[PDB]
Design a binder for this molecule. Sequence first.
Ligand SMILES: *[C@@H]1O[C@H](CO)[C@@H](O[C@@H]2O[C@H](CO)[C@@H](O)[C@H](O)[C@H]2NC(C)=O)[C@H](O)[C@H]1NC(C)=O
Ligand code: NAG
Lengths: 49, 99, 49, 30, 47, 49
Amino acid sequence: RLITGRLQSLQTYVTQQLIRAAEIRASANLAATKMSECVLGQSKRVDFC
Amino acid sequence: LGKLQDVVNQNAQALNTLVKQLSSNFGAISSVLNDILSRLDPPEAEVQIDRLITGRLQSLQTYVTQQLIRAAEIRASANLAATKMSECVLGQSKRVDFC
Amino acid sequence: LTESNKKFLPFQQFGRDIADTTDAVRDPQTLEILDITPCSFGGVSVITP
Amino acid sequence: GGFNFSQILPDPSKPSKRSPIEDLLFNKVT
Amino acid sequence: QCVNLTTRTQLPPAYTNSFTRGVYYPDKVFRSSVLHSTQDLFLPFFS
Amino acid sequence: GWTAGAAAYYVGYLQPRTFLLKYNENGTITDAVDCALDPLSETKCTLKS
Ligand SMILES: *[C@@H]1O[C@H](CO)[C@@H](O[C@@H]2O[C@H](CO)[C@@H](O)[C@H](O)[C@H]2NC(C)=O)[C@H](O)[C@H]1NC(C)=O
Ligand SMILES: *[C@@H]1O[C@H](CO)[C@@H](O)[C@H](O)[C@H]1NC(C)=O
């Protein structure tokens, strides 16, 4: 019973961390595009930078 | 190619892990449900079957959650590829360091 | 039980695969190798206009 | 005007409608 | 029946090194183009 | 006074250890990889390759 409880806690932690990883990946892609456009040149996209 | 190989290798190892899940006892005295039914009568073998069911359900829900994460990532990559198709291919994009 | 084209070493009875499933068995009658393939694949679907 | 597009355009010599580069691309990845 | 031996000059035992020896089939199944790991009594390499 | 020709035999002791066995298309063992001998062997047998 202690085993199955500890596995349940680790599984929900792994799911939460993987969701945070997806969110951090989306933010990282947005930041990389923002750097490559607004920083490494001038972006024509209005209200983006 | 890594981007075209990881999406296949991860799926293959997930399917292989799903196959490997049925070789584990989940704390029971046998892995296949037929052996317990043949060697023990069903009224007393109900807890063994139930723990096998809940272990297989936990494994399958873990696989489903992993597949949903992979689907979300592939959908994000597909949206990026669709935007690239619409801008970089289907015209000339003024966004520097994007095409 | 299909007729396979792979010969077994003369000390084995069963046979597994990459996915670790017993898909090859040797018949003890006259030493022929027979493959194992499940007969039920997938499910049903209905097309409606 | 001098642009060689046979590498990306499909070739009728093969029954498949694939360009040579995507032939190599399919043969590259398992 | 048996007889006893007489003491004499012998040689001390020597120690050598194995080179990828002591490997057998751990089970009686057929495996083709797989890389399967088992837990069984084997002889160590370079032992 | 006796003679025994020329012979030499080796005696080795087995230990409980995990081995990675390679199988070919014929079905015989071609190479074996350890997990508790070398870090390279451990890396090879943990990756199953
Ligand atoms: C376009 O490039 C291709 C390269 O694939 C050229 O095809 C080669 O042409 C040479 C010259 O005759 C041959 O020796 C090669 O065997 C050809 N290779 C292949 C894969 O076909 C083609 O000639 C070029 N076309 C133009 C107009 O420049
Ligand atoms: C081993 O496999 C090779 C490859 O097909 C084949 O040519 C050969 O006949 C096989 N040997 C035996 C003993 O089956």
